[PDB]
Structure formats: C-alpha cells, structure tokens
C-alpha cells in the first residue's frame with residue numbers, strides 16, 4: 001500500500017530540476033531553497049511524510065563516491081501543481097564554524113542542491129519512511145512541532161488538508177479536525193512558507209492554529225530567546241488536553257535535541273492529572289500516534 005524504495009542507489013531515478021526558488025526573505029539567516037523535480041519517464045510515487053535520497057556528484061576526502069543524503073518530501077503525493085508529475089524538497093545550505101579544519105565549511109549535498117539550475121539531472125532514490133505518515137481519518141487532530149526545515153513534512157500535511165486543489169483531488173479526505181503548528185525559526189524572514197501558512201489560518205480559523213517561536217524577535221518569560229520549547233511550555237496544558245484524544249496524532253521534526261524541552265513541558269502538564277508522560281508517550285508511539293523525525 002505505502003510506496004517504498006521504488007528506486008535504490010544502485011539504479012536511481014534520473015529526475016530533472018524544474019525550479020529552485022528561495023524561501024528565506026531578505027534579512028534572514030542562511031539559505032533555504034524550494035526545489036521541484038520532474039518525475040515523468042519513471043514510476044516514483046510517494047505519500048506525505050516520506051523522504052527521498054539525493055546522490056550528489058563528486059568524491060569525499062578519501063576519494064570515495066559521495067553517498068545519498070535523505071531529504072523530507074516537501075510536496076503532497078500529487079506534487080505542488082496537483083498533477084502527479086513532480087516532487088519538491090526544502091533544503092537548507094549547511095554552513096558552519098571555523099573550528100572544523102578551515103573557516104566557513106559548506107555541506108556537499110545541500111550546497112549542490114541549493115545552487116542547482118533548472119534543467120539539471122539529479123539521481124533520486126526512495127521514497128522511504130513509514131514513521132511520519134498522516135492518518136486517513138479526516139476527524140483526526142494533528143499537532144505539528146517544527147524547527148527550521150522540520151516544517152517540510154508539515155507542509156505535505158497542511159497542503160493535503162487545506163489547499164483548494166488538494167481537496168478537489170482527494171474526495172475521500174476532507175479534513176474537518178483541528179491542526180496546530182508550532183514553528184520555530186530565528187527571524188520573520190526565516191518563516192518558511194509564511195504567506196501560505198497564514199493564508200490557511202485565515203481561511204480555516206477553526207481547523208488550523210499557527211504559532212511562531214521567533215528567537216531573534218521574541219523573549220520567553222525568563223528573558224532568553226524564544227524557542228519552540230518555550231511555546232510548548234506556554235501551551236502545555238492545552239497541548240496535553242488535545243493529546244489525550246484517541247484520534248490525536250503529534251508530529252515532531254527538526255534538529256536532534258529538540259524533543260527534550262518538549263517532553264519536559266508535557267511531563268509537567270500530564271503530572272497534574274497523575275500521569276507520567278514518558279509512559280503515556282511510549283504507548284502513543286506503540287499506537288502510531290507519536291511521530292518523530294530529527295537529525
């Protein structure tokens with residue numbers, strides 16, 4: 001049922017870049033690109049919450065061919081144009097400190113992707129992943145806790161739920177539940193897909209809540225920069241109340257180490273009703289209602 005490994009690294013699908021557009025507005029930190037690829041000529045199918053591999057050119061420092069890097073799929077199964085012909089990614093250019101042999105270091109695959117030109121051919125593998133899948137139940141509640149490019153799978157869910165063209169293409173999925181995105185980025189220019197997220201909240205105010213944690217523009221009650229963990233703490237009681245519903249799913253995506261402050265906040269909330277969150281959460285994971293993808 002769920003598509004997986006239609007293409008593998010030994011015989012990847014050769015896609016073509018259609019577009020490569022910037023998502024970080026002026027005044028933002030770093031580069032994050034929305035890249036769309038042409039899937040025509042092959043049979044790559046996928047669903048929301050999955051990833052694909054990209055094999056970049058070149059050799060590593062030891063002379064060995066570069067291996068694939070995984071990227072969360074940014075588009076619904078139908079692609080951004082709802083034509084079942086494309087797939088999109090949301091790729092940050094990795095760049096980091098001097099300490100590691102040199103000065104500014106640039107990631108191999110992410111630099112390749114963020115600078116790729118339309119018309120270029122790329123090696124694609126996958127799709128992969130069954131741990132970030134969206135329920136078919138149109139009355140589910142969906143909590144989405146995203147940091148940075150952790151937004152990516154959330155885009156696939158929200159587009160499927162709320163885009164006019166998606167609703168028209170998906171007669172069996174007319175979302176009537178409640179979804180809540182808490183999205184942590186450093187600046188307003190760094191709010192990936194800001195305009196479309198706010199368009200969704202305006203059209204569906206009873207079915208979608210949008211909460212930002214903007215670290216360079218907002219301070220938590222303790223005086224520190226505002227992070228996703230601070231917003232979860234601020235709304236811990238209400239998030240816990242939603243989580244108790246048998247039909248609620250929670251999705252967490254972003255940098256590794258983001259889970260710890262989220263668990264601390266929810267643990268304090270659940271403890272007020274005599275529940276140990278770590279135990280309750282284990283049961284949610286087993287039931288397929290607690291979805292995590294961090295790296």
Ligand SMILES: Cc1cc2nc3c(=O)[nH]c(=O)nc-3n(C[C@H](O)[C@H](O)[C@H](O)COP(=O)(O)OP(=O)(O)OC[C@H]3O[C@@H](n4cnc5c(N)ncnc54)[C@H](O)[C@@H]3O)c2cc1C
Pocket residue numbers: 051069070071072073090091092093094096097100106107108109110111149152293295
């Ligand atoms: C399932 C999954 C989904 C993913 N989804 C996305 C996504 O949607 N968007 C996205 O942009 N990325 C995503 N990634 C990350 C992606 O796979 C790559 O790891 C990322 O793009 C960097 O790869 P690169 O080839 O550019 O860097 P590489 O050339 O592979 O360099 C990475 C290496 O640099 C070093 N390094 C990294 N940071 C530092 C630091 N701060 N200080 C010192 N050394 C450091 C580490 O040793 C690391 O192994 C995802 C990863 C996984 C596993």
